[PDB]
Amino acid sequence: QVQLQESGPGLVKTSETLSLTCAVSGGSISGSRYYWAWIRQPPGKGLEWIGNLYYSGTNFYNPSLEGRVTISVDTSKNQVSLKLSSVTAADTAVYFCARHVYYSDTNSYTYFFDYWGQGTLVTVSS
Amino acid sequence: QVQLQESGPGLVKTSETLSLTCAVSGGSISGSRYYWAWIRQPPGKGLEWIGNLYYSGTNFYNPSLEGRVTISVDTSKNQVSLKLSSVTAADTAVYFCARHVYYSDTNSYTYFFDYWGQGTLVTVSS
Amino acid sequence: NGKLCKLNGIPPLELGDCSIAGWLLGNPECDRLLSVPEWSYIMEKENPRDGLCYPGSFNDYEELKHLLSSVKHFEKVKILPKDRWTQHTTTGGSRACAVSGNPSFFRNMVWLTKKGSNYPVAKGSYNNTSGEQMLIIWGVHHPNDETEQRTLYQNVGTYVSVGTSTLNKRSTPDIATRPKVNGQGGRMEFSWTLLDMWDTINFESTGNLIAPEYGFKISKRGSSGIMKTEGTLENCETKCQTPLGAINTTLPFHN
Amino acid sequence: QNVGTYVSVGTSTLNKRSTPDIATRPKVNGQGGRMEFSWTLLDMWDTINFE
Amino acid sequence: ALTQPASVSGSPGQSITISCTGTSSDIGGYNYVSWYQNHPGKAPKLIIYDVSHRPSGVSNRFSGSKSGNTASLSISGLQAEDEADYYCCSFTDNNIPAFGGGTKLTVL
Amino acid sequence: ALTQPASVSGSPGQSITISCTGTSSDIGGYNYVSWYQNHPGKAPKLIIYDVSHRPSGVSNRFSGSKSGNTASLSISGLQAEDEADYYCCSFTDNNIPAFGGGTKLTVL
Ligand SMILES: *[C@@H]1O[C@H](CO[C@@H]2O[C@@H](C)[C@@H](O)[C@@H](O)[C@@H]2O)[C@@H](O[C@@H]2O[C@H](CO)[C@@H](O)[C@H](O)[C@H]2NC(C)=O)[C@H](O)[C@H]1NC(C)=O
Ligand SMILES: *[C@@H]1O[C@H](CO[C@@H]2O[C@@H](C)[C@@H](O)[C@@H](O)[C@@H]2O)[C@@H](O[C@@H]2O[C@H](CO)[C@@H](O)[C@H](O)[C@H]2NC(C)=O)[C@H](O)[C@H]1NC(C)=O
Ligand SMILES: *[C@@H]1O[C@H](CO)[C@@H](O)[C@H](O)[C@H]1NC(C)=O
């Protein structure tokens, strides 16, 4: 029953850093069965995974969009956040946060995005 | 006999972030009987508590002025610091740092601001 | 004679269904043992029920049971009164130790939790001026998860530190999912020391501290022991007592 | 990949959390590393968890 | 990435299948294929996970299976309400998620 | 916040009292009332703590007490040098400090 909500600038200029924050409510951000994922959908395109927050481990990112991305956490706010450096026109997209489940509650491994926020649309322009 | 001294910009513009730093000398910033407090006095007004640094715990803030305030620490400098986001005209004040004693040296709990710096006056304007 | 008798004219401590840990911590079901007269021996039931109502463990428990053999009477002394803990919540508890439905806790212990949204460093100390060596018990709460840790204590990277002129112990909680015992996936760990006369015990915590309210002053230190038996006291007297009944004889051997 | 790691094991009676000790050690059988083993008895109908 | 038909279509009441093809590395190796339903203006909804399972609250008209390197989403009783983009996602040898291109489902 | 008289006054040599009124939550509950003296241009000086105690170096003309939800600062032998703003502060059920509005003391 956890609610996820994205918030951030709907406009970032070319070559600046885009910073989006997802608030998590109705559940924790800490757990051993989950990763927090950032996913985006450019208009007219499919779903592209950006990267995961591994609260108790190390973060990992899409290898293409790797050198430009940082994912972090604020535990006093129960928020997770995404930063994309050197943004370009190609980075216009609806950005979503999601709860990515890798371990089930039936003593086995699984793999799915269970909860999604509704997303925030970000335009990149000059 | 600890001396406290505030330092920072005497002018911040509207909607910017104000950042003030208090140096502590003649004593530690680490201890189990104290919190470091930031307090302000707008001209013509009384004393408003902003928030505390709890070195070994979590920080806590005035619930009105909560979403805009961060308090942190630099242990290499033996300094504590205050950041107020989205500053407005209402934030003009003399800002003070203080040693807030919550546990006495007589095996009991107490509650007072024992040491104060002299304060730094910050103007917020457009 | 088939009976459990007073030994040398002094009745045993009959714990009924209580364990030693339940007794000393104050398990709510051991209320009849809150004020205890001098005893000649201890009658502990094998596999007692009223032990640690909040699931957990007790360190050096066998050594404590051994210590209590050569004790007989002791006095319960208030060392850290519950109401000294201002700026803390002292009313926590659990359904596991509930009394008449209502959540409760070990009666000689204070479960300190967050007040408002804060948990100030929990400090206090006691100087043993009671006249004799004192037994002090304390413990550490181990949450099932991080949410529980944050809910009870605002602080997460917590520690519990206890010490005397000889004791130097620092523990941290282990947050982990565990099988449930008595309905809880959490555990509470207890430990103890003896505070030498005229020494001082200090406590300090940023969370997960179960503080003593009381210590136990040893009063007699005579020779005794702990007997395992399901019987009761039968209003008779002996000089030698077996678990099966008392022996009245002058012969050199018995079977 | 992770460095500040832990190993947690428990049952209705076992509550153990260990962390690795990274250190240079004399080599034994060609390795400067060590592997530490421990054991428990899992009572009938209980459950052992590893994390 | 995984390959999906760009678009599929069918009449109300018919059963329609949306395929997703990968390699041995993603689909073939693991039984971790999941599917999402995405209506315009909304975040994706999980419909299928672990190849053939449904989350509580998901209609039983949705089902799925896999063979070799091909995964399949089956929608029986096609409704007007099912017009949506559908996506496949799976695990892979490189321990990161993989998404497919997406299929647009048009109900006639 | 705690309520204080906006201003009080009296002649040199007289005893003057500055009150501070709160609820059961701050003043009534705890014996943690403290008072500060604040001269213009300087940081506040602690004069009283724990309702009636003074820090070393503080004049014995300062004292205090409480009754119910009301705290009181008493200044005997009023001096010209005592013109200052005075503030009350106390602890509270919500574990944060509470300050009063402040009283200006005028010496005539
Ligand atoms: C812990 O307390 C002892 C005992 O204090 C005395 O007895 C108490 C019952 C009470 O009446 C106190 O006011 C007494 O002072 C302290 O030991 C005494 O220390 C003084 C000063 O150095 C010395 O003259 C006495 O002879 C000592 N008495 C004994 C029996 O040793 C001890 O210092 C206290 N510990 C701490 C850390 O404060
Ligand atoms: C661990 O398993 C026991 C036993 O489960 C039963 O026996 C297995 C071999 C298998 O056939 C299971 O499907 C059976 O349910 C669980 O204990 C049982 O719990 C039920 C429900 O409360 C109770 O009615 C039975 O009497 C219990 N049986 C015994 C022997 O105690 C136990 O709960 C499982 N532990 C966990 C954490 O799930
Ligand atoms: C043992 O028996 C004698 C009678 O032979 C009796 O007087 C005495 O009271 C009995 N014992 C004890 C241990 O009190």
Author numbering:
A (entry chain E), B (entry chain D): 1 to 35, 35A, 35B, 36 to 82, 82A, 82B, 82C, 83 to 100, ...
C (entry chain A): 48 to 54, 54A, 55 to 82, 82A, 83 to 92, 92A, 93 to 125, 125A, ...
D (entry chain B): 196 to 246
E (entry chain G), F (entry chain F): 3 to 9, 11 to 30, 30A, 30B, 30C, 31 to 95, 95A, 96 to 107
Paper text:
Influenza A viruses are categorized by their surface glycoproteins including hemagglutinin (HA), which binds sialic acid receptors on the surface of a host cell and mediates fusion of the virus with the host endosomal membrane. While only the H1N1 and H3N2 influenza A subtypes currently circulate in humans, the H2N2 influenza virus poses a distinct risk. A recent phase 1 clinical trial investigating a ferritin nanoparticle vaccine displaying H2 hemagglutinin (HA) in H2-naive and H2-exposed adults enabled us to perform comprehensive structural and biochemical characterization of immune memory on the breadth and diversity of the polyclonal serum antibody response elicited. The molecular details of cross-reactive and strain-specific monoclonal antibodies (mAbs) isolated from H2-F-vaccinated individuals were revealed by high-resolution cryoelectron microscopy (cryo-EM).
To assess epitopes targeted by cross-reactive and H2-specific head-binding antibodies, mAbs from B cells collected post-vaccination were isolated and characterized from six participants from blood collected 1 and 2 weeks after H2-F boost. nsEM epitope mapping revealed distinct patterns for each mAb group: H2-specific mAbs targeted a variety of epitopes on the HA head including RBS, vestigial esterase, and antigenic sites Sa and Cb, while the majority of cross-reactive mAbs targeted the RBS. The non-RBS binding mAb 4-1-1G03 targets antigenic site Sa interacting across two protomers with contributions from its light and heavy chains. Overall, H2 vaccination elicited novel antibodies that targeted a variety of epitopes including the RBS and antigenic site Sa. In contrast, the majority of pre-exposed participants had baseline pAbs targeting head and stem epitopes, which expanded after the H2-F first and/or second vaccine dose to target variable head epitopes. Moreover, secondary exposure through H2 vaccination in pre-exposed individuals or H2-F boost in naive individuals expanded the diversity of pAb responses to target variable head epitopes, shifting the dominance of pAb landscapes to the head domain. However, it is important to note that H2 vaccination can also induce responses to variable epitopes that overlap with conserved ones, leading to competition for the same antigenic site. All maps were of sufficient quality to build atomic models of HA bound to Fab except in the case of H2’s cleavage site, which had heterogeneous density and was omitted from H2 models.
